[PDB]
Amino acid sequence: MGPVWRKHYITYRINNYTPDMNREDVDYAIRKAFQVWSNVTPLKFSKINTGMADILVVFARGAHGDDHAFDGKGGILAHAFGPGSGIGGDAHFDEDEFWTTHSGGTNLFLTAVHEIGHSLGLGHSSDPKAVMFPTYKYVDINTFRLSADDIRGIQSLYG
Ligand SMILES: NC(=O)[C@H](CCC(=O)O)NC(=O)[C@H](CCC(=O)O)NC(=O)CCc1cc(-c2ccc(-c3cccc(Cl)c3)cc2)no1
Ligand SMILES: [Ca+2]
Ligand SMILES: [Ca+2]
Ligand SMILES: [Ca+2]
Ligand SMILES: [Zn+2]
Ligand SMILES: [Zn+2]
């Protein structure tokens, strides 16, 4: 078992907003992505605008201040740090992607589900059905379900 948050109340903050989407659509996608994980664990997530936010959500491009530089449009879509203080837990999204509420460009919701999985301590899954599989693929939000493997993984960390 890798690092996990040692509390069940976890805050997040949206540092900045991609211009690709309306602001309310970014809020909604991120909120719904957290809800995917709280639906199957004892964890609760609250959005705050300053202060001690555990998970900082950031949109940035190329070299952006950590050791995980982005690569322009395509390739790496986002990355996130596992539980820990400071940069720990933070989720970074490559602004060179075109973020969407839908199937065009890169769907922010699904990518956020994957990245939050990392922010909570999950590694990649070798199961192609799992949201933690390494490669992105689109599916409608209304049809999306965590896989049994994703649920096994997150419940092994938090119950
Ligand atoms: N196919 C690709 O490789 C794409 C885009 C290609 C491009 O335009 O160059 N890039 C990415 O995928 C990069 C790859 C980084 C690397 O090269 O290793 N991945 C990263 O950046 C990881 C981020 C990521 C992965 C996912 C994901 C979404 C849905 C499912 C899902 C599971 C089951 C059923 C269904 Cl329908 C969907 C699984 C994973 N969201 O954000
Ligand atoms: Ca943090
Ligand atoms: Ca990229
Ligand atoms: Ca963009
Ligand atoms: Zn980063
Ligand atoms: Zn990943």
UniProtKB/Swiss-Prot annotation:
Positions contributing to Zn(2+) 2 binding: H114, H118, H124
Induction (free text): By exposure to bacterial lipopolysaccharides (LPS). Inhibited by dexamethasone.
Binding annotation for Ca(2+) 3: D71, G72, G74, I76, D94, E97
Tissues showing expression: Found in alveolar macrophages but not in peripheral blood monocytes.
UniProt: Zn(2+) 1 binding residues: H64, D66, H79, H92
Positions annotated to bind Ca(2+) 2: D54, G86, G88, D90
Binding site for Ca(2+) 1: D20, E95, E97
Superkingdom of the source species: Eukaryota
Active-site residues, as the UniProt record annotates them: E115
Compartments in which it is found: Secreted, Extracellular space, Extracellular matrix
Domain remarks in the Swiss-Prot or TrEMBL record: The conserved cysteine present in the cysteine-switch motif binds the catalytic zinc ion, thus inhibiting the enzyme. The dissociation of the cysteine from the zinc ion upon the activation-peptide release activates the enzyme.
Family: Belongs to the peptidase M10A family.
Function: May be involved in tissue injury and remodeling. Has significant elastolytic activity. Can accept large and small amino acids at the P1' site, but has a preference for leucine. Aromatic or hydrophobic residues are preferred at the P1 site, with small hydrophobic residues (preferably alanine) occupying P3.
Protein name listed in UniProt: Macrophage metalloelastase
Organism: Homo sapiens (Human)
Gene transcribed to yield this protein: MMP12
